[PDB]
């Protein structure tokens, strides 16, 4: 029944949106190159350029829009007539017997009528070693409509009829199928769902669900018929496993309650999270076959199936939303090279889906294409500025680069602390050393191997070697100079104060981290 919902003049809007994107990129590059100083004074070896003003304006507008969306969501209340059917879809491969039980109990004890909620769990690898998950599923839902099937096959390898009738007629269903991947189980569940439900909620085998997540998502979906998908806030079960887990939790809060909120202000959320997400069933059934059979210019994709789901939803003119009243708890890596592998995978999926997302910019707000362009072009300018200031041959240059990076991080952390109302977000300033060391080389590693474990060590080694050589060259070249001149003396009176401030900031941040974590 739903259609593409194209605009009245698709070609004109396409042309003007592409022209706007090209003009924005050209203007940003011209402002970066020109280095035109706006505000200046003496006795200060730094100024505010047009590029810096543009970045500050972008940060200000993103913060303002996120705050406005959060306030609007908080103020409004919705009926939730409780007349819509929901299907909770869980996929499992080898989930820990400790996390799957929590997930199943959370799904069972959610706050939604039992005659409107139907739970389906699909398990990969019916090799007699994965029956411990079906047994636990049966144990959790002993006194309900339970249908369990072991399918010696798959949808892309009878069983199909039994699977479909069990999923569409029963309430709690557990299907075990041959191993095909995360896409295979999700496709099997979506196809077996049919037209038996109105909304399809997607979950993982590890996510612990809040009791109000389903009802809040249904409430936000029922308000407007234009909405096709919605997400929710995702928390972390283990924020104290290591230093990486704590930073990951802070980054999760930031990316969910600032970036995603700002995107949802214009109803153009780019990605719906895996653990929390609701989709309209009719649109999903429309685009399911196309979504399954998608390749990146001749290569199958096994990454970012939630980002691709959101892209498919957006490609039909249907807007995606975000609500913070629905919460869930997931698990994040606590070890290096594993968080690094996850970040590399996410960057690969984002780069691969950027080209597909660029096709449907005309159907949504101009903020979508603006943010896509700026987020795509920011890291390259980051690297160029870093290289130039590193190899400029002055110690004050690298010191000021570090100070500027930390100042931007501190501004973001202060805004996050004010928005959340809680003070732990000041430690979000510590993500600068993680982004500048691993994430930046990982972006280029993902870009150079877009078509495709101790492998991402090499980009880290190259980046570290380049940085160390640059710092050594700058130190050598400033060691061979005469500082008796009154210009290098003002440079010295800046260097001393900057170093003192930098060390003091590092000391207070480390002390605050230890105080907040140890207690």
């Amino acid at each position, epitope marked *: 029944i739903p259609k593409d919902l194209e605009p009245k003049h698709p070609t004109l809007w396409r042309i003007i949106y592409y022209s706007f994107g090209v003009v924005l990129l050209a203007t940003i590059t011209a402002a970066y190159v020109a280095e035109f100083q706006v505000l200046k004074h003496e006795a200060i070896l730094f100024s505010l350029g047009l590029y810096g003003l543009a970045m500050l304006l972008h940060l200000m507008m993103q913060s303002l829009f996120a705050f406005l969306e959060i306030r609007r969501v908080n103020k409004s209340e919705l009926p939730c007539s409780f007349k819509k059917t929901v299907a909770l879809t869980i996929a499992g491969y080898q989930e820990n017997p400790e996390y799957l039980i929590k997930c199943l109990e959370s799904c069972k004890y959610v706050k939604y009528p*039992k*005659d409107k909620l139907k739970i389906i769990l699909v398990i990969d690898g019916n090799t007699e070693d994965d029956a411990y998950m079906m047994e636990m599923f049966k144990d959790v839902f002993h*006194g*309900e*409509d339970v249908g369990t099937y072991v399918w010696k096959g798959n949808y892309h390898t009878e069983g199909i009829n039994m699977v479909e*009738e069990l999923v569409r*007629n029963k309430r709690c269903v557990c299907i075990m199928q041959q191993w095909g991947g995360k896409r295979e189980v999700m496709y099997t569940a979506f196809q077996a769902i*049919g037209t038996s*439900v109105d909304y399809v909620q997607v979950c993982d085998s590890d996510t612990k669900l809040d009791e109000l997540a389903t009802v809040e998502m249904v409430k936000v979906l029922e308000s407007n018929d234009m909405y096709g998908a919605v997400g929710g806030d995702v928390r972390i079960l283990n924020p104290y496993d290591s230093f990486i887990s704590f930073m990951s939790s802070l980054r999760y809060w930031m990316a969910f309650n600032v970036e995603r909120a700002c995107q949802s202000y214009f109803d153009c959320v780019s990605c719906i999270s895996g653990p929390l997400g609701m989709y309209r069933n009719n649109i999903l059934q429309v685009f399911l076959e196309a979504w399954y059979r998608q390749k990146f210019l001749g290569t199958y994709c096994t990454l970012g199936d939630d980002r691709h789901l959101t892209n498919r939803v957006l490609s039909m003119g249907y807007r995606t939303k975000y609500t913070h009243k629905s919460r869930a708890f997931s698990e994040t890596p606590s070890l290096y090279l594993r968080w690094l592998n996850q970040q590399t995978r996410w960057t690969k999926s984002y780069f691969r889906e950027w080209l597909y997302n660029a096709q449907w910019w005309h159907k949504h707000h101009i903020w979508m294409t603006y943010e896509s362009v700026v987020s795509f072009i920011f890291p390259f300018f980051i690297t160029a500025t870093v290289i130039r200031l590193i190899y400029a041959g002055t110690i004050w240059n690298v010191v000021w680069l570090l100070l500027c990076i930390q100042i931007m991080s501190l501004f973001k952390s202060i805004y996050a602390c004010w928005l959340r109302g809680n003070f732990i977000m000041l430690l979000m300033s510590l993500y600068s050393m993680l982004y500048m060391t691993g994430l930046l080389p990982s972006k280029y590693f993902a870009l150079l191997t877009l078509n495709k474990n101790y492998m991402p060590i090499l980009p880290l080694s190259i980046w570290a070697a380049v940085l160390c050589g640059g710092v050594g060259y700058s130190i050598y070249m400033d060691c061979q100079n005469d500082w008796s001149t009154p210009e290098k003396q003002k440079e010295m009176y800046h260097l001393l104060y900057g170093c003192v401030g930098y060390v003091m900031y590092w000391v207070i941040m480390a002390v605050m981290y230890w105080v907040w974590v140890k207690r």
Partner: antibody
Amino acid sequence: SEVQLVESGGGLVQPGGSLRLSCAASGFNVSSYYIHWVRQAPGKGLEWVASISSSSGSTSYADSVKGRFTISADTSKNTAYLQMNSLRAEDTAVYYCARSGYYWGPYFGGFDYWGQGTLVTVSS
Amino acid sequence: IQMTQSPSSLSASVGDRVTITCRASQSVSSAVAWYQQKPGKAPKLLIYSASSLYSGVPSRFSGSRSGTDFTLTISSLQPEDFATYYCQQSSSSLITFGQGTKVEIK
């Protein structure tokens, strides 16, 4: 434990009085299934009377039943109840009890595990 | 809403394939089920969702739908198959039963 449904409270009653039939379930929980009351007049076809969904409170009746009859379900005894007041001479039939699943769409599942019949006679 | 069974009374021998047609004016989001009942006994479920077969029912019974019409077919009529067959259009807030279609013998 095999699914069984037993009926109680049927008999003779003068017109205008009241009756309380009871449907005792065994082998399952009424909170995970629908409970329907179906009656068959002497020498006639089946007629649906009322339906109750426990843990949700959804009750449905018929045009010739609504207003007079009430349906409930007690989970402390794991039974269902049908209270018929303002009985008429036309309500004499054999009342059954049926179990079913839930309504999702074009798929329902059916009326599996029918109970026995209890006889109600409204006459002078 | 009205549910009409086409053959009110049907007679066939043993081994005869017999079909029963059932018409309902409300076929938007309501499932159609087919039940069988014998004298002095509670009805038993034969077919649900207008095509699926209940566990334990012999594979001779089958169900089909063609637009508004719903059909129940018995390929071979065994002596134990003589009973009264009923339709049911069951959705929330309204359930409607069919009537008649008593299968007899010559």
